[PDB]
Amino acid sequence: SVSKANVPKIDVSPLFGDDQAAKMRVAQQIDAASRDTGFFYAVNHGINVQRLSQKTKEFHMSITPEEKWDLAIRAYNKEHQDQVRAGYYLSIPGKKAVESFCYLNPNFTPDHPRIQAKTPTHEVNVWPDETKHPGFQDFAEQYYWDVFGLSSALLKGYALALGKEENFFARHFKPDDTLASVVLIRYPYLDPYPEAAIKTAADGTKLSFEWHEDVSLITVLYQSNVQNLQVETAAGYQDIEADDTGYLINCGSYMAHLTNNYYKAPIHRVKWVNAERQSLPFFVNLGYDSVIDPFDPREPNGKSDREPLSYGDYLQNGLVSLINKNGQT
Ligand SMILES: C[C@@H](NC(=O)[C@H](CS)NC(=O)CCC[C@H](N)C(=O)O)C(=O)O
């Protein structure tokens, strides 16, 4: 008595090519999914997810407490005042089970103009010692570009779905300046599992992370094959099936803003499961000054009474608000 949500599997391979009629047939599927539950699995994506999972497991199981403090974001280590987003997010044994590592655009180097200007939401990534984690930084940086490619293709499908030219979103999603992030999250098996680390929903469901809409344009997520996510629907919360061969895709609240809620940002939550598993989201964020004029695909003239919002303003407000609502992660 918690039924499964309709989450279609869509073959996105035409989005990488030049068959325009085939791309329109993919765009139709994206439209349908975005108007129903808001979630779909992208299949035939070209990314080696098994390897991704293996490399990530090797990192999570070998990092030590010393390394974690040395990489910690400022919420856990006061000496690291520049690390708001990038770094290690520690667990608190007996109180908080989850732990994670976040990194941003590898092009945000010490000489990048936005780093020199000290613009909010831009940081230089921190990495563990190469001899303790051979090949990890290089793997993680190449993964960023692999998922960036998949995301650009997906944004082509969303633009066509909405009646726009294929580069409508993608032209604002650029290697030199995207604020996109990867998060490598570890959810542990624990015996006993501390009650303090388990939250409870109004409907009685045990949770690891409460209800929310994503802070993103779209979210491109790989998870282990253990069911955990739920989406709010007409008929209550419904289970999203796991599939550790595909990427789970949904719209974030910036997409909802731009489309006047034609494509809603679905409300979803993370169930508590006592299992050792991985959750590896890529948050598709645009540039700091990117602005798309809002429109409404349900209106004849397509006009909307929403005002333009720059991406940088959206993102900094969003990330802080999500911490205030659902806690530091
Ligand atoms: C999917 C994953 N959830 C999450 O990652 C949750 C909700 S979408 N996301 C966040 O807390 C936002 C992380 C932002 C990141 N630090 C950045 O600076 O860009 C999970 O819990 O499994």
Ligand SMILES: [Fe+2]
């Ligand atoms: Fe989410």
